[PDB]
Design a protein around this ligand. Structure first.
Ligand SMILES: *[C@@H]1O[C@H](CO)[C@@H](O[C@@H]2O[C@H](CO)[C@@H](O)[C@H](O)[C@H]2NC(C)=O)[C@H](O)[C@H]1NC(C)=O
Ligand SMILES: *[C@@H]1O[C@H](CO)[C@@H](O[C@@H]2O[C@H](CO)[C@@H](O)[C@H](O)[C@H]2NC(C)=O)[C@H](O)[C@H]1NC(C)=O
Ligand SMILES: *[C@@H]1O[C@H](CO)[C@@H](O[C@@H]2O[C@H](CO)[C@@H](O)[C@H](O)[C@H]2NC(C)=O)[C@H](O)[C@H]1NC(C)=O
Lengths: 315, 149, 450
């Protein structure tokens, strides 16, 4: 049923309590087609966050994957505790950014954009797993009755008690809500070739922060993503990356009040659970340098010509 | 070569090379330019990367059918409620909608115990509702994937 | 009789392959609005064709419409018409070249958007090869044009029959879109005007048989009857083609797709084996040749009188016009390079309606003080009076909306027409270096005036 153009049929597999080497086997072989990609839920298995753990997860998945394949990422699901209860509220925004800058297809569980939390366990007449009912609460739309989910007297599950201040309706007006940041990140990912395509180059591991870059050949622009997963600290980008101006302009940040502001390259101050995306104009792409050919990956390599405004393969 | 010059005076300067060779040179230059344009077109059509697929460019949205939206005052979410909220999904710049199991079942947890693989559970609606939802999703440029046990 | 057969074969043209997207591009995916839009376009084309037939039976050829303008207006008006029709023909041939190259190039890209650079390059190459084939060689090929007409009518009949069969079968997924229509939001008047332009391009496309109608032998006997027997047939064909396209495709993919026929065949019969693109490309190439010849003819026909470029009235090579062909190629290349296809259609038929306004006021000038001296007519020219107001409504609101400055540029070029006309004729100034350039070009290309 996948012969008609524009109607390709996707199919993926789910294997969770397994190792990475046995999981990447579902990608198939260069001459045998098995699956588009197996679903990746290693991020959703984290109960605490630090630079080292996220670095290990990302590096393991990106190294064990066959070359030229399409990765994917998840941060939650119907069988895992919701993110704001697993890791805390402060990490709600930054993780979303992490979802929208890594290469591959991101997958979002319903209610993650708003930032729902788990509900206290309750028993039902129907047979259900009480250890997983905490992540199946109804969607919160507005501050009306059963959060606007239903107009009936009783719902099949109780609604979270914080819906009076956490729902879709109220967040569409607040300019600092998580929904606005999610929409901005989605739009940026959809309207930039550097994010939906191009190289992904990661620097050395660190206990506090994770820093990586996205770039493409012939664009003369790079995105530098910096995330702080530890405590409030200070960072000097000059040591990690050479050839940067003294001042840089933030393209996007978790704290929406700092959008468009200027920061000093040596002395960036980061709070607990902060994220910055810098847009830099240069010509020294990392993946062409000799020190970083072992830490950059692509799928469907291409090069962009601005004079002709096209894409070509031979580079 | 005066204004309105007739045929007889035309055979007076065309014989000169300065008026004999440039015409042929221009003709062959034009045909060469045509061939160059053809070669450039056929070169650009080749050497060009294959474009990304629909499942490679956009994020996916995972929905639990029983806890999204109720539309008949019964306490359980259904497909009609999902259809009624497609504008919100579109506003999120989502490309694919992922719906978990909704078949006619006797056990709805601990994986799933399916009673019929070609029916929709009554608490979620009917097959007509599913077809309407699929049509609505396809109209808005979205795509739908479902779970399989 | 075969006269209506020839008339419909001329009328069908080639725009039907491109318009269904553009009309659906405007009006914001409202099927009923689009159906009404082509209904109105068909009626407007009925009236314009009737008036053109009147002018043709009252005046032999294109130079005879020029002389009609001379009779009822000044020479400036006729010269302005000539130079505007030059741009009209250049834009038409450029649009046909774009459509041909674009249809030819689509199949390589399966389910994505074709880059603009290869499309423009192939359009330029096709236009140049057609231009160099017209001069110094072939003027018309009967076998190829007959084959192209047969292929086009066969493809149209096949599409219509498939749509009829699918509608008759009564499947819900094929008919449900026709039911509960009009629920889409109502667009602004500018989108209605754009849809009208696209539909008029579709339906009147190829219906330029005024010169052809001038050689008929039954004035006021069968020509209105021939129109009444031919035009509604192709109207119904076009409407049912829309029916089929909307039956087996959604508006979203029709708008997003470039080749409506190619995707229609892809979804309907995934066994086309590249036959459909090749057939449509051959038909479009034949139409390009016919159109370039039919546009080159009036320039040379009117070049013999009242023209500053006396170099234009110079048959050369194998008895072929040269200057007109070269000028048409240059203007077509500029049109290809500087702009896209849909806006070309918009500007072209905006100018066409603007000049049809003056044609209608000239016809009314035949009745301004002498209403009895009008041509015999069924309802005594009542319809042209309403069509004048229709054209006024077409031309007014694009100015107040003002979404593109090119609309103002069209009028700037029109006024520059008179600006150039004034010193040449009123002052009668002649340039020696102009004569030097003309003589040099005559010696270069063996250009002579017979
Ligand atoms: C279904 O759940 C309800 C409440 O959890 C059970 O009891 C119902 O409600 C009150 C007490 O909670 C009783 O007085 C009602 O008679 C019960 N209603 C019904 C319709 O039974 C109820 O026993 C449970 N039923 C089953 C089959 O497990
Ligand atoms: C619940 O949501 C409404 C929707 O905005 C909040 O606003 C109330 O409803 C309308 C909309 O502004 C106003 O006319 C009312 O005066 C608002 N209420 C108040 C108390 O200002 C409302 O504040 C939210 N909370 C509650 C408890 O209703
Ligand atoms: C970055 O690399 C590794 C993280 O795996 C750290 O080096 C190791 O640290 C652990 C902690 O005891 C031990 O395995 C060894 O002492 C180190 N070497 C090796 C080879 O494992 C290193 O400290 C990390 N950098 C940080 C955290 O800033």
């Amino acid at each position: 049923y996948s012969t008609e153009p524009g109607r390709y049929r996707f199919m993926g597999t789910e294997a969770y309590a397994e190792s990475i080497d046995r999981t990447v086997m579902y990608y198939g072989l260069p001459f045998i087609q098995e699956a588009d990609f197996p679903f990746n839920n290693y991020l959703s298995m984290l109960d605490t966050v630090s630079g080292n753990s996220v670095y290990e997860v990302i590096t393991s998945w990106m190294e064990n994957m066959p070359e030229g394949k399409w990765p994917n990422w998840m941060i939650g699901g119907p069988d895992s505790s919701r993110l704001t209860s697993r890791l805390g509220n402060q990490y709600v925004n930054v993780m979303n950014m992490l979802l929208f800058t890594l290469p591959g297809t991101p997958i979002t569980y319903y209610g993650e954009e708003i930032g729902m939390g788990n509900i206290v366990a309750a028993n039902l007449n129907e047979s259900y797993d009480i250890n997983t009912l905490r992540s199946k609460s109804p969607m919160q739309w507005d501050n009306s009755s059963n959060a606007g989910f239903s107009e009936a007297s009783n719902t099949w599950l109780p609604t979270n008690s914080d819906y009076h201040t956490v729902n879709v309706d109220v967040q569409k007006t607040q300019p600092r809500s998580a929904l606005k940041l999610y929409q901005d990140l989605s739009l940026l990912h959809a309207n930039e070739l550097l994010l939906n395509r191009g190289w992904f180059c990661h620097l050395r591991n660190d206990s506090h922060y994770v820093v990586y870059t996205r770039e493409l050949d012939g664009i003369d622009r790079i995105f530098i993503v910096v995330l702080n997963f530890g405590e409030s600290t200070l960072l000097n980008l000059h040591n990690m990356i050479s050839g940067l101006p003294a001042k840089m302009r933030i393209r996007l940040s978790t704290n929406s009040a700092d959008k468009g502001s200027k920061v000093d390259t040596s002395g960036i101050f980061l709070d607990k659970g902060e994220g910055l995306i810098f847009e830099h104009n240069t010509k020294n792409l990392l993946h062409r340098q000799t020190a970083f050919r072992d830490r950059c990956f692509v799928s469907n390599r291409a090069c962009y010509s601005s004079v002709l405004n096209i894409l070509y393969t031979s580079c | 070569p005066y204004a309105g010059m007739p045929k007889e005076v035309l055979f007076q300067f065309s014989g000169q090379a300065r008026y004999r060779i440039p015409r042929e040179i221009l003709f062959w230059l034009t045909v060469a330019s045509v061939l160059v344009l053809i070669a450039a077109t056929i070169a650009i059509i080749a050497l060009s990367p294959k474009c990304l697929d629909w499942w490679q460019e956009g994020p996916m949205y995972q929905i639990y059918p029983r806890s999204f939206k109720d539309s008949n005052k019964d306490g359980n979410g259904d497909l009609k409620g999902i259809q009624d909220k497609l504008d919100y999904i579109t506003a999120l710049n989502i490309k694919t909608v992922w719906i978990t199991s909704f078949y006619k079942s006797s056990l709805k947890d601990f994986r799933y115990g399916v009673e019929d693989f070609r029916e929709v559970d009554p608490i979620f609606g009917t097959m007509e509702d599913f077809e309407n939802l699929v049509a609505a999703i396809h109209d808005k440029g979205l795509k739908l994937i479902i779970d399989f046990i | 009789w075969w006269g209506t057969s020839f008339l419909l074969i001329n009328i069908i043209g080639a725009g039907i392959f491109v318009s269904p997207k553009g009309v659906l591009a405007y009006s914001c995916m409202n099927v009923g609005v689009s159906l009404c839009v082509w209904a109105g376009c068909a009626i407007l084309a009925m009236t314009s064709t009737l008036c053109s037939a009147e002018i043709s039976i009252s005046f032999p050829c294109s130079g005879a419409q020029y002389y009609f303008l001379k009779r009822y207006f000044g020479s400036t008006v006729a010269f302005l018409n000539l130079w505007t029709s030059l741009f009209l023909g250049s834009g038409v041939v450029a649009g046909q070249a774009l459509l041909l190259a674009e249809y030819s190039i689509q199949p390589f890209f399966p389910s994505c958007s074709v880059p603009k650079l290869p499309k423009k390059c192939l359009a330029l190459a096709m236009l140049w090869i057609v231009g160099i084939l017209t001069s110094r060689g072939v003027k018309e090929v009967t076998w190829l044009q007959i084959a192209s007409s047969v292929l086009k009518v066969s493809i149209l009949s096949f599409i219509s029959l498939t749509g009829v069969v699918f509608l008759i079968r009564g499947k819900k997924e094929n008919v449900e879109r026709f039911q509960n229509a009009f629920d889409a939001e109502l667009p602004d008047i500018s989108h209605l005007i754009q849809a009208i332009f696209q539909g008029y391009f579709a339906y009147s496309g190829g219906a330029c048989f005024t010169l052809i109608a001038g050689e008929l032998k039954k004035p006021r006997t069968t020509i209105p009857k021939c129109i009444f027997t031919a035009l509604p047939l192709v109207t119904v064909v076009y409407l049912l083609v829309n029916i089929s396209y909307l039956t087996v495709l959604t508006p979203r993919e029709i708008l997003s797709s470039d080749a409506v026929a190619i995707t229609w065949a892809d979804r309907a019969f995934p066994s086309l084996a590249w036959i459909m693109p090749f057939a449509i490309s051959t038909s479009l190439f034949s139409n390009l040749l016919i159109s370039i010849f039919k546009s080159s003819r009036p320039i040379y026909l009117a070049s013999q009188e009242g023209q500053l470029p006396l170099l234009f009235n110079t048959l050369n090579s194998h008895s072929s016009p040269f200057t007109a062909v070269l000028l048409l190629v240059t203007l077509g290349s500029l049109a290809i390079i500087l702009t896209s296809l849909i806006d070309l259609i918009n500007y072209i038929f905006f100018t066409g309606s603007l000049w049809s306004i003056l044609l209608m006021i000239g016809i009314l000038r035949r009745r301004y003080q002498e209403p009895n001296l009008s041509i015999p007519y069924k309802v005594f020219l009542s319809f042209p009076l309403a069509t004048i107001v229709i054209d006024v409504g077409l031309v007014v609101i694009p100015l107040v909306k003002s979404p593109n400055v090119h609309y103002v540029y069209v009028l700037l070029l029109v006024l520059s027409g008179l600006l150039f006309y004034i010193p040449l004729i009123h002052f009668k100034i002649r340039l020696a270096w102009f004569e030097k350039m003309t003589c040099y070009l005559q010696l270069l290309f063996n250009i002579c005036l017979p």
